[PDB]
Design an enzyme around this catalytic site. Structure first.
Site, PDB file in Angstrom:
ATOM      1  N   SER A 138       0.897  -1.174  -0.031  1.00 12.33           N
ATOM      2  CA  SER A 138      -0.033  -0.063  -0.090  1.00 12.33           C
ATOM      3  C   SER A 138       0.953   1.256   0.126  1.00 12.33           C
ATOM      4  O   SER A 138       2.092   1.261   0.346  1.00 12.33           O
ATOM      5  CB  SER A 138      -0.979   0.007   1.261  1.00 12.33           C
ATOM      6  OG  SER A 138      -1.973   1.063   1.265  1.00 12.33           O
ATOM      7  N   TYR A 151      -4.280  -0.076   9.979  1.00 12.83           N
ATOM      8  CA  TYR A 151      -4.024  -0.264   8.732  1.00 12.83           C
ATOM      9  C   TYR A 151      -2.583   0.009   8.324  1.00 12.83           C
ATOM     10  O   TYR A 151      -1.914  -0.888   7.859  1.00 12.83           O
ATOM     11  CB  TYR A 151      -4.987   0.551   7.665  1.00 12.83           C
ATOM     12  CG  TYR A 151      -4.804   0.283   6.286  1.00 12.83           C
ATOM     13  CD1 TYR A 151      -5.289  -0.807   5.761  1.00 12.83           C
ATOM     14  CD2 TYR A 151      -4.172   1.335   5.337  1.00 12.83           C
ATOM     15  CE1 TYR A 151      -5.230  -1.381   4.266  1.00 12.83           C
ATOM     16  CE2 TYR A 151      -4.133   0.745   4.072  1.00 12.83           C
ATOM     17  CZ  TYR A 151      -4.395  -0.321   3.464  1.00 12.83           C
ATOM     18  OH  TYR A 151      -4.590  -0.515   2.262  1.00 12.83           O
TER      19      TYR A 151
END
Lengths: 228, 229, 228, 229
Positions: A138, A151
């Site tokens: 990510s 996250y």
């Protein structure tokens, strides 16, 4: 030289675009989807050419089943692409611990432990082909802004997976990652559609083009990892 | 518009020559900056007159302008500039007499850093017209130690700095990225790669299709060398 | 155990605060200043307790002179702190190459080549004490926003110096850096005065506290290296 | 206000015990979370009753709340929380049977990551009242390979992620940083450090004077191990 890839998180988003892209490039493809509607979506396009498993990456037998059906249909496995993931919707550290704790367990179960599970299940077959792994990381593996702390920490753990596994499994198996971001306001001035972020996956899987790439993370984020 | 055009420094040897062969094979019009006439003859024996070739020194700004100017006159526009000409420092130790350090430092930073600035300065107005890209050759020395002395490693870290600053500054118009090769002609992957093996990241980073969403990125291709031995 | 430090860029900003801080901590201090007014500024405070050299870090003999006068006064050298630096005032890559080229030569002469020069001059004495080097880097060594491309690239080169020299010179000499930023709007909500950013320098110089720190960059930037 | 108060998990052994001794020596009121009664007796033999000590498991949220609650009742406020309790994975290979990997993974991430979240959640309301700081123990495994299996290295990378996300989220009120020790009880510096040697970065990062401008930072203290061998 017929190549075989197996993709988790394949029923939507980048995973669905990877199925299309590896199919278009000549691979045999198996795919793990969350539910039967996603399975029908792939069947409408590719009819019976894929091996599709409907299940939850958090269950290890589902991962073993995906590899088992891949080998039984296509004979071998050349690349495993761990891609299923989940967001935390900017969960603040101030929230009730009850919410933090359960959200952490899910985020880390899907985004990190599932990758270990998928790779453990895929490893004996990757050793016979000296294949490769490609994980989905990510922008949140590098920069803050695109998630809450759970996250962002799960996406950093994936970066640690890449370096540790690449080192442990070399020379036999290459391990790499792709860090997409800002997809479906970046310095490049637009959000990308999932179709635009697939090419790094194809390079890292390619046995010709990626033969010398291991331990590598390729950012594809419109420059989000830079500034805003 | 379909027809793409790429201009490559350091093109007469090693990785740069393979970039010529690779981009030509992918369908680009290619111009190339080369150090001497022998390397020019190498490129002509293979490609006849399909290339635009300038012979000279990348440390000279006018030569970089010449490379661009000939590219435009021969091909009309410029889509991608690949700054790749490099030099090593042969593990020059910091204990050596300063006279030697000072000389090497000037040569390393002029070639590995300053002439990247010069090429990009010369290519910018044409890259803006096509909203094109830049690809720089960094190094495994941009990330880890072992593969050079301190001058070389410092110059290759400076290239990482250019990639981040220019990508931020030139967005959204121009993409800027880099490739960090290493262990070319013992790695964790167990072999040394031929220059022919390390060109795919450049093609990805220059492609307006596959790379349209990539800027500020550095693609390592080093057989795991950055990981350690 | 009497310790001796030599500081470039000592006549202003962080360098002047380092002179104060190492003096306050018990060190003997020598200092390289740009001009005679800065020298008087140090003399008004410390009278004759320092060795002061007035000169330009870009001249190698000025650096040799600073070490020579340090050893002649205090006998040995324990820590060299390369700190003099210069900004590029956000010089854009679009400017006339004539301006880009001359600005590059100055920025890299001061921010990078001078550090090599100061360390080359200081090395034979650091080997006899098994001393240490501390370089001044920048938030611009890590993130964009605080300079033009020339400055940001010069500050990245310093990061490469730290890792290369730390590795080459170990076990004998420790090499580290400090990355200050936003000093004299950060996530911490204020700009720091140069006095606030000195403590990392003292830890990295300390022979007791930093005995096991080499190859390290300590960011002190109000979180600028993070987001905005 | 002058009097500073620090609370330390993983405090009965290794680095954490030296943090107790170091912060006590610097003048702090110290509370400490310890795994068992023997480690409690170790701390009492040295400090009598000057400390506030909780015995228990950092993976249990109520224990973290208890640590904080006793700290406030005994000392009134809390200035710094040091999350340090850790566990290794003894180079667990990825080829091992999944049953073993699954168990180790749960234990590693519960201790090295989840219980950092739990401690910080429990300490937050009190850190906001003092606009205090957090220091986490990361690892050389947060940056390089070699010093653990993949579970350990992944957990230590997750800690780097927490440092960046929490420092961004909690600014300007609360500073968040980390120390990455390595090669404790062969490095480029030629020796292994005793835990007593690696505590100075923690003191710097907790000090409201020396560290007031430091957030999002990670201080490596590893004898050069991250550089390579």
């Amino acid at each position: 030289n017929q190549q075989v890839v197996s993709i988790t998180g394949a029923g939507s988003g980048i995973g669905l675009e990877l199925v299309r892209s590896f199919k278009l490039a000549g691979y045999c493809v198996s795919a793990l989807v969350r539910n039967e509607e996603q399975e029908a979506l792939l069947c409408n396009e590719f009819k019976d050419a894929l091996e599709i498993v409907v299940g939850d990456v958090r269950d290890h037998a589902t991962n073993e089943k995906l590899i088992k059906q891949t080998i039984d249909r296509f004979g071998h496995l050349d690349c495993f692409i761990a891609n299923a993931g989940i967001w935390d919707y900017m969960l603040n550290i101030e929230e009730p611990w009850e919410k933090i704790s359960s959200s952490f367990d899910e985020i880390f179960d899907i985004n990190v432990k599932s990758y270990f599970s998928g790779i453990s299940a895929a490893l004996p077959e990757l050793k016979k082909t000296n294949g490769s792994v490609v994980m989905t990381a990510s922008v949140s593996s590098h920069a803050v802004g695109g998630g809450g702390s759970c996250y962002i920490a799960s996406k950093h753990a994936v970066l640690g997976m890449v370096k540790a596994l690449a080192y442990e499994l070399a020379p036999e198996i290459r391990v790499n990652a792709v860090s997409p971001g800002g997809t479906v306001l970046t310095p490049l001035g637009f959000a990308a559609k999932p179709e635009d972020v697939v090419a790094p996956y194809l390079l890292l899987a390619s046995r010709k083009q990626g033969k010398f790439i291991t331990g590598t993370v390729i950012s594809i984020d419109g420059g989000m990892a830079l500034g805003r």
